[PDB]
Amino acid sequence: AHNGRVCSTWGDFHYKTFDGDVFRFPGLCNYVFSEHCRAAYEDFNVQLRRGLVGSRPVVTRVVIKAQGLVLEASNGSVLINGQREELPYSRTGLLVEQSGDYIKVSIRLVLTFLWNGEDSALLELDPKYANQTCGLCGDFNGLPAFNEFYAHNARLTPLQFGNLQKLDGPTEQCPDPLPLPAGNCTDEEGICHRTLLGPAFAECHALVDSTAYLAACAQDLCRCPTCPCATFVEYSRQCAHAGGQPRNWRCPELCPRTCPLNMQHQECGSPCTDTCSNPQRAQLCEDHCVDGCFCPPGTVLDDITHSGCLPLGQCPCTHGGRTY
């Protein structure tokens, strides 16, 4: 599956490259989050801008440039080639949607960009882009620990590394984040260890190592104590992307989620929600676990009038745009 063709950015400036690295980088300018830069002609150029909401680390603007298409996501709005468009916007090879809790831009055979809207942002790239990319997401050569941080045979700190992949505005001179002093807190109550090493992500321990995620959970605990679940969410996403089946870890106290009356909030639900417009879409799907709202088995979704998930034999039909 999507073994090592994924990079991510979450929570308190935590960056995860394709090959498995994790590092914190508290930058606050525009950065080349990834880019086709070892090719005669570039295919994609995805950039991030990270900012502050009062104190919360967020992503304020993404600019994906791909094959002559410019896509600027910011302020809860999407600009396609300079024009605002209403979601979803679809064209040959491109589709952008408000699917689930996020904004997902899939440029078929190029990339898959999920953006939760505030802090998370995840890139899936084609296997043919190996070794030809460069940016915070790394080089996609498959070797994590050895080739991202050697600038002319010298090893760099994540602050320096993230500062190399910097890009100022035409009239902007953004500074660099001075190193954060030592940390504190750690996991005193054991919440990170109890959850991450708990039952839910059992098989996730067999695919993705949790050490960096444990550290990030502790570091977020040092930050506000309503925002420690970002690392758990990211670990769920990564475990789902490697191939393993994450299990439900959310409890009414552990960052509770809500879904509509007939829709349940699941970790690892089938991405293709069967809906009696196409009540058998979920037959031979190929896509890993995805989190979001889902329907209890048997009662497919009703996308024709949006009455929630409905039994197969009580949902409407459509003829010529007329509901029956």
Binding site: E35, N45, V63, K65, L164, L167, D168, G169, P170, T171
Partner: protein, 368 residues
């Protein structure tokens, strides 16, 4: 009508025989390095050079009468972000050295020398706050721009035609021979030719660049296009020069610079200034071209001075009106910059006062 003639700055043509009978007035050649990367040779062979070394910019290669050297240094994350950082006129087989740095400091034999200076027929002076003129008696003349960034212009008395060597080419009115290296064969590309003229063997060879800096950032694209388009606008102030100098290489320079420059305003204004100065070299007086653009170069002027679009000659000094000035009989193409306003003179303190406030100097003695 028949009987009429018109003279360009480089030639004169008479309408007769139903044709133009054209003769060539003498023309001092003009090499230049602009943007820190682009080179316009004496034969007008524009080519970009992304190098990190000191390069023999021009040298009368029969002997070592003079050797204008340029040190070009990498200025950014990418290997194609370069700046000119010095201009080292080496003279008399290296016996004399005039080194104009990037901040304006001028060194005579590695000793700081304020300006103007006048010795060994060499005259160093600032026509304005933007330019430094190094007029030598050997035939050439250097004109170095500091504001907004560092650019160099080299002027040759036509007698040296077909004799020089170096980066700027042999000055023989032939664009195909410019890449004739010392091995007797024309090199292929710009950088292949330049990597034969490095000063130090330990330098890193220049490489050929295809990566347009414009393709990287979209806001950089919009900014650079929206401003550098002022070059090719037929309604623009620059338009007057279009019928003489083709502005396409200048537009390409402006695009590349601004899309690549860290202070892209600096490189944008440098490219526009370069086009303006080349046009003034051909004999066109572009004025009032900074409408809503590059005005921070108006405002940053030293106190008691003001900007001037046409500084066509001498800086008016009080000492000079007292006891004349050997500095001030030099013909240079009219450059722009900050200067004392007309009718006013700068005293030895550097401040600008009218003529009535300034003493007359007898034997070098101040006399109110």
């Amino acid at each position: 009508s028949p009987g009429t003639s018109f003279n360009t700055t480089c030639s004169s043509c008479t309408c007769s025989g139903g044709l133009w009978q054209c003769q060539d007035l003498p023309c001092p050649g003009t090499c230049s390095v602009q943007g820190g990367a682009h080179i316009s040779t004496y034969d007008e062979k524009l080519y970009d050079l992304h190098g990190d070394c000191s390069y023999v910019l021009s040298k009368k290669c029969a002997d070592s009468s003079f050797t204008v050297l340029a040190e070009l240094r990498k200025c950014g994350l990418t290997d194609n972000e370069n700046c000119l950082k010095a201009v080292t006129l080496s003279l008399d087989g290296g016996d004399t050295a005039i080194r104009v740095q990037a901040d304006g400091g001028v060194f005579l034999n590695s000793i700081y020398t304020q300006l103007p200076l006048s010795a060994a027929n060499i005259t160093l002076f600032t026509p304005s706050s933007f330019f430094i003129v190094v007029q030598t008696g050997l035939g050439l003349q250097l004109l170095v721009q500091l504001v907004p960034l560092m650019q160099v212009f080299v002027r040759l008395d036509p007698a040296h035609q077909g004799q020089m060597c170096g980066l700027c080419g042999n000055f023989n009115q032939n664009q195909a021979d410019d890449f004739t290296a010392l091995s007797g064969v024309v090199e292929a590309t710009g950088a292949a030719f330049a990597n034969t003229w490095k000063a130090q063997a330990a330098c890193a060879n220049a490489r050929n660049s295809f990566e347009d800096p414009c393709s990287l950032s979209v806001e950089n694209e919009n900014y650079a296009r929206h401003w550098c388009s002022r070059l090719t606008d037929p309604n623009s102030a620059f338009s007057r020069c279009h019928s003489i100098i083709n502005p396409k290489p200048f537009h390409s320079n402006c695009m590349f610079d601004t899309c690549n420059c860290e202070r892209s305003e600096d490189c944008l204004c440098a490219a526009l200034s370069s086009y303006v100065h080349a046009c003034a070299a051909k004999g066109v007086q572009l004025s009032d071209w900074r409408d809503g653009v590059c005005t921070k170069y108006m405002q940053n002027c030293p106190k008691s001075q003001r900007y001037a679009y046409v500084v066509d000659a001498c800086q008016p000094t009080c000492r000079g009106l007292s006891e004349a000035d050997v500095t001030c009989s030099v013909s240079f193409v009219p450059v722009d910059g900050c200067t004392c306003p007309a009718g006013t003179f700068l005293n030895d303190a550097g401040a600008c006062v009218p003529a009535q406030e300034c003493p007359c100097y007898a034997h070098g003695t101040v006399l109110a």
